Structures are given as structure tokens and as C-alpha cells.
Design a protein around this nucleic acid. Sequence first.
DNA 1: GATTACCGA
DNA 2: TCGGTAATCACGCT
Lengths: 388, 196, 51, 56, 76, 98, 98, 50, 65, 49, 451
Amino acid sequence: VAEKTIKSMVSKAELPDNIKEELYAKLIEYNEKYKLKKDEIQAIIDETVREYQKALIEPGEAVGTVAAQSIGEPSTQMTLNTFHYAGVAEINVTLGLPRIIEIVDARKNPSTPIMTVYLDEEHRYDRDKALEVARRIEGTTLENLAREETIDILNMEYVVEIDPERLEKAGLDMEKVVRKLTGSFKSAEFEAEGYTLVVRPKKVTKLSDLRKIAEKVKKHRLKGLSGVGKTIIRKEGDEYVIYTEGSNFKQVLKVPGVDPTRTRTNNIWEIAEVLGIEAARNAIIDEIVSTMREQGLEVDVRHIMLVADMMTLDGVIRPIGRHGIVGEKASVLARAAFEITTQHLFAAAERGEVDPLNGVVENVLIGQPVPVGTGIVKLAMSLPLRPK
Amino acid sequence: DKFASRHGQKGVIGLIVPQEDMPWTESGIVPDLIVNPHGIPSRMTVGQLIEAIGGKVASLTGRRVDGTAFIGEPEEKLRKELEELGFKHSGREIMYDGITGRRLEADIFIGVIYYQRLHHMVADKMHARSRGPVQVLTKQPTEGRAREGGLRFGEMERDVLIGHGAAMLLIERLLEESDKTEVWVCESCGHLALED
Amino acid sequence: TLAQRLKGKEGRFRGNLSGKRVNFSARTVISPDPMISINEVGVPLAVAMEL
Amino acid sequence: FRYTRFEKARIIGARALQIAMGAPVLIDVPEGITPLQAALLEFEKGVIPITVIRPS
Amino acid sequence: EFNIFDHVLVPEHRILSEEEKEELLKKYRIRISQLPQIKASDPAVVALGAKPGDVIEIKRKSPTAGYYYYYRLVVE
Amino acid sequence: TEEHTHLELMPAAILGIPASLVPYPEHNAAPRNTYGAGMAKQSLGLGWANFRIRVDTRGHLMHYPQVPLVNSRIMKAVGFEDRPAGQNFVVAVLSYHG
Amino acid sequence: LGEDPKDPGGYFIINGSERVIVSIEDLAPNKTLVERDERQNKVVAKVFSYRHGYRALITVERKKDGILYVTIPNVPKPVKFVYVMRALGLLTDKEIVE
Amino acid sequence: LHPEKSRPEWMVLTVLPVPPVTMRPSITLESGIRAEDDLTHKLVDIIRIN
Amino acid sequence: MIVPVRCFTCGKVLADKYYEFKKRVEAGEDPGKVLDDLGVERYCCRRTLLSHVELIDQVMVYKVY
Amino acid sequence: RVTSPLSRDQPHFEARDLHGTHWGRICPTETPEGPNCGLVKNLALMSQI
Amino acid sequence: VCPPYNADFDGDEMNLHVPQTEEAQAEAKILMEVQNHIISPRYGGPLIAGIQDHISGGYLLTREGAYFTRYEVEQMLMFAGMDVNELPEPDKYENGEPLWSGKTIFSLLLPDDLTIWYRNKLCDEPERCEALEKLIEEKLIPDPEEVRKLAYDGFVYIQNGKLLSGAVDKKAYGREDGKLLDIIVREYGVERARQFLDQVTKLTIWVITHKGFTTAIDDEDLPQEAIDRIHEIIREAEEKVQRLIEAYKRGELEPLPGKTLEETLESKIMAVLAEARDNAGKVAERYLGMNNHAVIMAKTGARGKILNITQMAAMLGQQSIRGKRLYRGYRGRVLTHFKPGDLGARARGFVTNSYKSGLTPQEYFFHAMGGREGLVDTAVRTAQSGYMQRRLINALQDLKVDYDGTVRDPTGIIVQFKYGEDGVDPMKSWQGKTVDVDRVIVRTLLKMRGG
DNA sequence: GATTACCGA
DNA sequence: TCGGTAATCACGCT
Ligand SMILES: [Mg+2]
Ligand SMILES: [Zn+2]
Ligand SMILES: [Zn+2]
């Protein structure tokens, strides 16, 4: 009845059953305490082996076609949703059908990057200390602490202006005004009316072209780490999260306070270059899952793990059309009915190229039975054949 | 034969049940179009239900009720003109079923709605083709019913059969019920031969 | 010319080779009946005498 | 040794084509039957001669 | 301070031995070139002792099987 | 008041000519009216008096057309209550045998 | 004469099939427009202009250095403003100012 | 390139092949007027410039 | 398109009681009492007198031999 | 009818809308469905050109 | 069979094509018949299942108070296929007359050793389910007479092919998950479950035919004092908008750090308007009872929501366009009936009359603006999804499964070992998972212990 | 006419 | 950085 008695009844039966299954079956069987004793214990295990043996896949299946159809059906019923979501932190992340094209087609650029930032054990519960970490991530120049630029009369040429209230609620630290001299060119120190007068005692190179200085040092200021966009803080699960904007990975992971082991991303090519290919496996898988569940309608994750484990097939992730997997290695007729380009592509493989067989698009094109499905079985039969 | 209202309740004749099996009412009324009740509180077409009272009011009174936008006949004044002419204020009436004959324990709604027939009639759609005249250039069937041609199976329809696993059907459908040609081919050159 | 006969979204890979027109078909409208089983279908007797 | 769903639909397909080209039938008679329906009755009693090859 | 490992995205790798290459080759009746090829970049392989022309095993996890192996190669 | 600068005519004529066929078009939803004004251009109906002496590629004729009950006062002043299209059924709303 | 009085007219009988011109909606000729910002570059100001036939875009663009381009149709090669404006009819810099 | 299947000097067309008649059909318009095929119409104009 | 000689739901003749009906509404008399004065009881008989077009006049004169 | 010379297929999310100037000149509802859906539009019933 | 085809009956077109050769015809019959496709490979749940009348007929059969007389029981068992001998027995409540109950006419279709218990959509009182659940879990087999007549109408409980307590709605059929057609294809073959769905369908449409299911105009009607409850919500929500314009105009901005003053203003305003429409939706929903035939169609679920039945005797909410409120128009004023420089609720796209109490002409033209945004996104989005499917099929149509469990491309490069994290077909897995120990334990024990 | 991305100084 | 060019954009039916 006790521990030894049960565990070794599964151990004997084990060889057709699975490893995961074993742990599962025991931990529920033990739990039930109005207990059943011996004969129905053997009846349950000999029934669990029959359902697992009943539900294995038939050899010869056509996996790759029913993966592309069950991911392309739910995007046609993608009608309007509640675009007036009631959140604040996550902002403008292009929900719907235009996300699914951006994850399938590689597209180095992607619009609206939002990288989720999680925090460690020392910036977890402290409210205002978590704020200065988000201060350290954000970073601000001088151009966004203004509204426009007004010229002087003769020689002062510049002034700092409206407004100053970004330094009493976030705390952008008027001591940093002193700090400005860091590796700069001239760096005069004079604060009369709260703005630092910088004199330029030289000649013809800068005469009156104020507009080109707006691309130099006036814009090159980097007041804070991780030179990326704005940061929003939300309260979830007794940790503060910092839902930032943009994507600057190897700088962001080297920040004093971000927990490095858990920061998920809405980008594809950077998680492949930094964390490796098999991490970008899990970036593609976890992102198409999160789009489907938010829109109500579900797809099973056998279909997602066939596309993702085929799109990282050659060590660098590929796109899906006309430059990726169809444009990669195949028969030369397989590339003919996709990417109607053929004087680029069909006359290129005119030079030194054979073409055997063994696609699915060729044997249908030439008149042969395809290899998948029922063209996979091989028969044999003897011949006395008495009727009786 | 596709019918429709002017509110957007399109549909097709389901069947054509005789007059004897009709759920009829505690008067001489036998309905014509037994509309599905699962379509009115799903599409938000309340103007259907206001017009149904407006047909019953403006047939018993004598004068065709004005129903123009924004200045027409109001809602509440109709339901009093029906209520003093001899009927319940909301259309509902006592109805007896015609198969067995007992009052259905509900009060079935009934009115007068103006429908209109559409020209998506069925005798301009049905065609069958066993083996007809073919294309001159490819020897494949033609296009359209006026030139006696069948359907065309795009790249969607080729892939929905490979998903099953049908490889025998995929040969017989695409090439055996199509053009087949026998060709003499050389061995060591690869080019086609020439009969004479 | 030749490159537009081979190609052009209705050329001779999708237009005529890998998607072809077939024989022994029909096409008409649909209309319910809940009295036949789940895996049967009605067929008109005009289409039934030409297939 | 149970057949799959792809092997069961090929053994019937080859046996229904032999049963049309000669190949005398087992006890399958009654009263009129299309050559496809003769192969379905023979597979139920387990007297199919045709066996599969399982590459392994 | 961190590495590429100890992360909820990266599964743990290990470099095979010399006798396991032929043992894996007879289990699946394949040819050595028919395996899906990590590049010599992309830090998952570079912190191990990456030699081009070798098989490296990953032990990744799926929420519907448990643990599941998936073999790869190293190309320049 | 003493604030305005003009004064409207009847405002029941914002909409077009086949969208002025739908009675009470402020009670329905918005996509239901668009389908309704897209099917008055497809109904059958006796439209002109010279369908007999005419050669057009295909024509239609409906034997017993009827002037509708409750409608706009606009469709009296275009001519639609003189060449109409469609009849007046007497419907009922109940779920029949399937 | 073989007609009906309710026929409104407004259609030719070119070749035996009654054909009607459907009014194409222009974009206000000989006007000028102040086009939007940040599609690929900074602000542009496009226009159309035609008389007795040929129409053409004649835009006065600018990108992020203060060039003030002018666009010509034939041989496109976008030309700076002060090249053409000096070479056309005015020589004095004071006249370009005023 | 490949020395038996793709010589580079064969890329310059010294002899242009003519496609057959069965690939260039002659469509009849009303009852006796024949619309010349688009490939046929350009090949006629090639020979007059040669 | 002359008046239908039956109704469309209730089988009852109507074409004898249309041209007597309309010649007593072009005097100004209300139709609510004229249709009641004749033999019209329900409102399924009555929706097809009260809405009709009498279009036979226009088409007839156009002629085809 | 009043048609509009543009491309029939590519989306024009700001040129297929319904603008405040259409009040009393263009009908708000009549628009045929298909690829057009807002490139052919009808004049109102009280206007003058 | 009309959620696989995704069809309706407003004049569509379906094409058949006969297969001919004797190899391609015996392949069509074994591999492609309908009953093999009762569950779907995208999510496991059943796809070929009940629709509009099949759900809402099944609620009228299993209500408490559905007592059929002797002629109506005997007539419907002949119409729904089944073949039983002279056992409609035993006239369970002879209190008025000798007539049966509604549960036991449904308990002739089930096989003889089912045991299932679950809670469905109609549960309005969660406390009175608790009592039933607690007793069941401790005393595995009580007696079906005594204790089980403490039942509810939202806790389905069947044992031994006998529905003791429940009410059938869209959790036993349906285009999405119904776990009473689901548990009959994994336990009792397939060919049994084609005649469960063939006898349910004809039994259920019978009772919805001879009981009446009209829905007239009075189903949307509210008495006078309930209407005045709505108007105090619309007045003060407009007063909060008129106050929030004055806070922005005199410099009482109260800004958010991220957004600009115009974008903070629009945020706060829309939230007030949104909440106002849901608060008035709860007033109407609380009031009109669940006894007319317009909320029966909405609770159970067959072409309805509980939004568009309170969008018919209440507000119609705001009327937005891709997240912005209506702003396109003249120079600072949408229609020329409003004084310019105005950000009020009534003046910037917000209707306040029902689909019963008439829309005034600013509200109707505001309503066409929001309606054309819905029709453009049908024809735009369809062409991008159609081309996105052609990319993925034509790149992925090569992959098979070998006999030793390996997915391989045409060149012999192994793509995925031991197909799909080995190895169970998602068409026959349960909700992503594998062998389902939990259900097995309860099922196997019950039959053995029960005997 | 709009998105990209590959190619070219 | 930085400018340049092609090549791509549902299903069926009249
Ligand atoms: Mg349809
Ligand atoms: Zn030869
Ligand atoms: Zn009548």
C-alpha cells in the first residue's frame, strides 16, 4: 500500500510507457486517499499503457501541409477587436494580423520594439529605488528638454529654456549640469541664470550655422546608460516591471540592477546574435503563442514547433519567401512555381545542374506518385492462391 | 431562389411546405414566410420589427403609414392605433400548430414585411460537365458555362489533398481526368523522337 | 512574348500545369435538410444523370 | 501487428483492382455488389493474402 | 557576471565523444553532412571548445514531452 | 436663437437615392443599411413602360408588383411609387422543423 | 416617338449600347497644397498645372539640409531653387529677396 | 559553368531557333478572319529587318 | 399589371371589388370605411387592395404586333 | 455616381473613410462591397453643381 | 456539417467531383469520410457539432418544469431514430396526470456506463453548486433518488447513462469545446458517435418546433422607472466631461509623464465614456428577466451576446475610429452644427439614443463614420492573409514522418527527430497534453467499483 | 503607390 | 551612413 508497493508497480510496466508519464501517474495515484488496494492498481496502469499506445502518430503522415493550413486559417477570421484596451504600460505594439507577418518574415527593422525588463532581489520591492533604475535605463538628451530654440542678438548665441519640471518628479539631477564637462571640447563653467554659458572663441568654421551644431554635441549628449527610449513601470506579482521601448541588448544586460536571466524581448534578430540560435527558437515559439491567446482563438503548439524548428535549419534564421526557404536548396522546378522571377532563377541553374526527383511539387507536375501519404508503403504477395 | 428584405436579411428558400401544415392564428391568418427567430436579436435590425407593426396598423386603418427618416411616424403612436383596432400592443397572437393542433404555449409574433426577389436565381448556376470541348493550345477544358467548361482546382485545392495523404486520388484527379499524351523519347540524347 | 507566356500570375506553372481544369464535376447552390445522416449528401437528379 | 490507416487503404485498393481483372473471389456472393464493396467484406474476415513490408 | 547559460531561454549543451559519433550514425542510418549546422559564431557554441566538424547535443525542454534531444553540427 | 447664421431645409435628404428606400433607417445598425442600399439595385421589378419594344441583352419582368406599405415621403417624389419592385408578404417569426 | 416620360436622360447611344460617362473626381487644378511631413524626408509642397492638355507635378521640396529642391518632369535630376530662379528671369539678389 | 552542357560562347546567339506552329496557334475572329498570334506577329517583323 | 384574381394567402376573389373601391376613393371618402362596407374582414385580404399599381394603361398603348 | 481615380487594390485607410465635408453632398451609406469599398460614391439628393 | 465548410445558406456555391478508378475510390472511402473528422487538428476540440437550434432546443428539454405528456414522449422517440421496445416507463410524477419528466427522455441516448460531471455557462449561483460537489467527491456512488433531488440547473451530472442533474447548453455540443461529444469519441469508437449526433439533432429540433420560440418587439422593452435610472448615468458622465474640459483650459492639466496634454486628455475622457456605457449595460441586464426568448439565446449561446441586447434598450456607447475619437471634418469642428473649438461629449462622436428611441441626425452621421471602418477591414485584411498562406504552404509541403519517427526533408537532412517532441498526434491529444491519467483513474475505478 | 531589402560609392 | 533599382499585392464567376 505504501511507497515501495506503488512505485515498483509502474517500474515493471514502464518499458512501453514514457518518462514524463511515470512521475505524473504516481503523484496523482498517491494523492487519492479512500484508497484502492491491488487489482485496480494493476488495472489502471494496464489501461494507461493502452491509451498511450492508441494515440501515437501513424507513420507516413503529411505533417508539413497541416502545419501551414492550421496557422493560415485563424488569420482570415481576424476581424476587429477591442482596440481600446484598458492598459497604460504596454503601448502600441501592433496587435493582430500585422504582427504575424513581422514574425514570419525576418525583417531586421521591426516597428515598435518593446523589451520587457525584469528586476533582481535588491530592486524588487523598493518603490523609489526601482525608479532610479528606470532612470538609469532611459537616458535623455538636451533637445527633448525644450520646445524650440530662440536665437540671441549678437554673440551669446544660445540659451536653455522651457521647461524645468522634468527634474522634480523624475529627478534628472541638476548636479549633472556640473558633470557636462565629461570628455567635451571647451566646457566653460558659468551658471548665472541657471544655464551654462559656453563661449566659442574661434572663427570661420562656425560663423552663424546654428543648425549644424544641433547635430553635433547638443544632440550627442547621453545622460544615462542604455541609450534607448522611454520607460514605464507597472506593479505585477509584487515585482516592479520596466516595460521600456527599443532594443539595445548587450548594453541593457550590463546595467546594475536588471535581473539578466529573465528579460524577454519583442525582437528576433538580436536574440539570435546575442543569446544564440536555440534561444531564438524559443523567441519565435513564445511570441506566436502570445498573439493567438490575446485574440481569443487557439492553435496547438505542435504546429508552431514545426515552423520554428525548420526556420533555424541552417544556423542563421531565414525568411519564408523568395529569399529564404524556397530560395534555398531544393529541386530547380520547386523554385519555378514560387517566386515568379524565372529569368533570374531558372536561367541561373541552367549552368551545371542536375535535377533528380523526390519533391512533392515535381511528381505532381510530371505525373508520378508523391512520396508522402499512401505512396510510402511497399507490398509483397506469394502465389499458390488456392481459393477454397 | 435568393430573397432579401431592404434591411439586410438575405436568404434562400429552405423548403416549400404545404398550406395544410402551417402554424396558423386565432383568425383567418396563415403565414407565408416563417422567418428564423435566431437572426433578429443578433444583427440589430429593430427597423424590421417596427415595420412589422407598421404593416398591421396601416392595413387595418386604411392609410399608408409614413415612415421617412427623422420626421416620420413615431414609435409609440403606432402601438396605440393597433391597440384600439382590436389587437395586442406588441403583435403577439395565439397560434395553433397545423400538424397536431394545440396552442403552442407562446405568443407568436406576426406582421407585414415588404420583401423583394433577387436575380441570383438557381437556374443560371447549375451546370454539369462529363467531357466537353477543350482548349486548342493545351487540350484542357474551357471556361464558363457558355463555352462548356468545368472547374479549375488552384494551388489551394492541390494542397488540401496532400494534407490527407491521398496520393492515388491526386494522380487520378489531376492527370487521368485531363490530357494524357504518349511520347516517344530517345535514350542517350534525351530529346524527343520523331515519328514518320 | 515568351517570358510572359511562361509567367505572369496566370502563366504556365500555376495557370495550366500545377492547377488544371478537370472533368466530372458540377457546381450549384446549397440548402439545408436535417433528415439525412451526418455523412450523406443530396444530389439533384439532373446532375446525377450527367455524371 | 495492427495495420495503420495508410496501409489499410492501400491493401483494399490493390485487392479491389485485382478482383476486377479476374482473380476468383472467396465467399463473397450475394445478389450484386460493386468491385469496391467486395474487398470490404473480405478484409473483415481476415482472409487477405496481401501483406505489407515494414522497412526497419 | 552572467553567461549564456543559467537562462530560461538557452538549454544546456555538451560536446560529444569520439565513439558516440559512429554510434549515433548507426542508430539513425544517416550521413554526417545531414545534420542542422550551428555556425561557428553565435555565442552558444563559442564558449565550449568549438571545433568545426563535430556534433553537439542540446537537451531542450518542451511542455508536452519533458526532455528532448536535438543534434546539430558546427560549420565555419 | 440670435446666434445662428443659416437654417436647414428638411434634413431627411442627407442620404442618396437608393438609401432613401429603407424605412426607419435610424433604428438599424450601420452595416445592415449598407447591405440594404446595395440590394435595391438588384431586385427584380417592372422599371419602365417600354420593355416590350426594346432590345437589351437580358431583361426581367415581375408579374404582380406592389407599391410598398410604410415608406419615405421621398419615394413618392422620384417616381418609385409608380414603377415599383417587390411584394408585400405576411411574415411570422418562429423556429420551424429545422 | 417610342419612349417613356419617366426616362431621365444623360447617356449616349454610341454604337447601339447606351453608354454613360461617370464623373471622375479631380484634385482641384491650378490650386496649391501644403503636403505632410516625415514619410521619407522633410516637408514638400506638390502641385498640378495644366492648360490645353499636358499636366505635370511641379514640386518645391526640401530635405534635411536646406536645399529647397524644385522638380521638373523631363530629365528629372532634381535642381536647386537658386540655380533656376537666378537663371530664369531675375539676376539681382535683392530682387529674389523682395 | 560545365564543359559539356554549358559552353560560354554558346550564350551569344548566332542561330535563333523558331518555335513550332503548334505552340503558336491561329485564332479565327468572326468566321474567316484570322487573328495572328503575338509570337507570330513579332517573328514576321524579325525576318524583314534581317 | 391588372389586379390578382385571388389573394396571395387567403383564397378569396378580389377583382370584382377593386374598380368599385377606387371610384369611391376619388370622391374624398376615407378608405377605412369603404373597405369595411364591402366584404373585407381580415387584413390579409386587405393588404392587396390597398397597395397596387394598375400599370396596364401605360404598356398597352406602346404596341407590338 | 462619382468615381475616384486611384488604385483598386492597395489599402487607402485615409482615403476610404467618411469625412465631414460629405454632409449634404455625398451619400453616407451607398458603397458597393468588393475591392472598392469606398472608392466609388454617390451624390446626395439635395445638391447643386 | 457546417463549421468545417464555414458556409451559410445565403446563396453560396459548393462543387462536387466524382473519383473514378478503383484505387482512387477505395482510398476516398476509408481515409476521407466525415465521421473520421469529428475533431480538428488545430485544438483537439470537436468541430462537426451542434449549432443554433441544437443548443437552444436542448435548454427547453432539460429545464426544471419540462414535463411532457404521454403522447408527446411516444411521438418524439419515433422521430429521433431510436428503436426501443415498450419501455417509456415508469411515469415518474403522476401528481397531476401520468406523465414523464424531461431528464429521462434525454437519458435514453447515452451509453450505459458514462460518468461525467462538469459545470456550464448558466451558473448564476456558485454557492449552490458547492454542496452538490462536496457530497459527490466523498461518497462516489450515492443513491440516485434521495440525495440527488437536491440538484441545481447548472451542474451536469450523469452516471450509468442516466442524467440525474443538469441542463444542456453549449457545453455539450458546439463549434468550440463541448465535453460531452468530446468524451464519446475517445471512449466508444467513432461509429457510435455518428449516431449519437444523428439522434440528438432530430430529438432536439422536435421540442423547439412544438413549443414555440418567437421573439417579438416587447423583448427589448423597459418600464418607465428603469429608463430614468439610465438618464442619471448619462447626465453626470456628461458633467464629468464638461468639468474635464475646464481643467485643461485654465491650466489644471494634471499630466501623465509619458504622454502630451492632448493625449492625456483623450485618455481620461474615453475611460469615463467607456465605463458609462458598461454601467448602463448592467442596469438593463439586471432588470429584464431570463424568461423571454431573447436572453435564452444569449446565456446559452447561439447567435448572441449580452452586449447587443443592451445596445438595443440603452446607449450605443461612443463611436470611435482606430482608437481616436471622430475628428476629421472642417477647420476645428466635425459637423457644421457645432461651435468650433469644442471637446464636449455630445459634440465629438458620442451617441446617446438607442436602436429603439430613434437617432437624431448628428448621431446617425456619426454612426456611418464608425460603420465604414468595419467594412474596409474585411476586404483589406483578406488579401494580406491570403498571400501569407501561399508563402507557408509552398515552403513546408515537403515534410513527412518516417517509420522510425523522424521528420526529413527531400535531401535527407533531418529536420526534427522523433516527430513533435515525441510523439503523439495533436489531432488525438487532449488539450495539448498526453495520456490523461486523471480521467483514466476516475473512469476505470468507477466501472470496477460500481459493477 | 506602398512596403521592404539587396546592391552600389 | 547612403542611395539606388526591381519584384511582390485572396477564391470563384459574368
Ligand atoms: Mg455565403
Ligand atoms: Zn538520341
Ligand atoms: Zn390575405
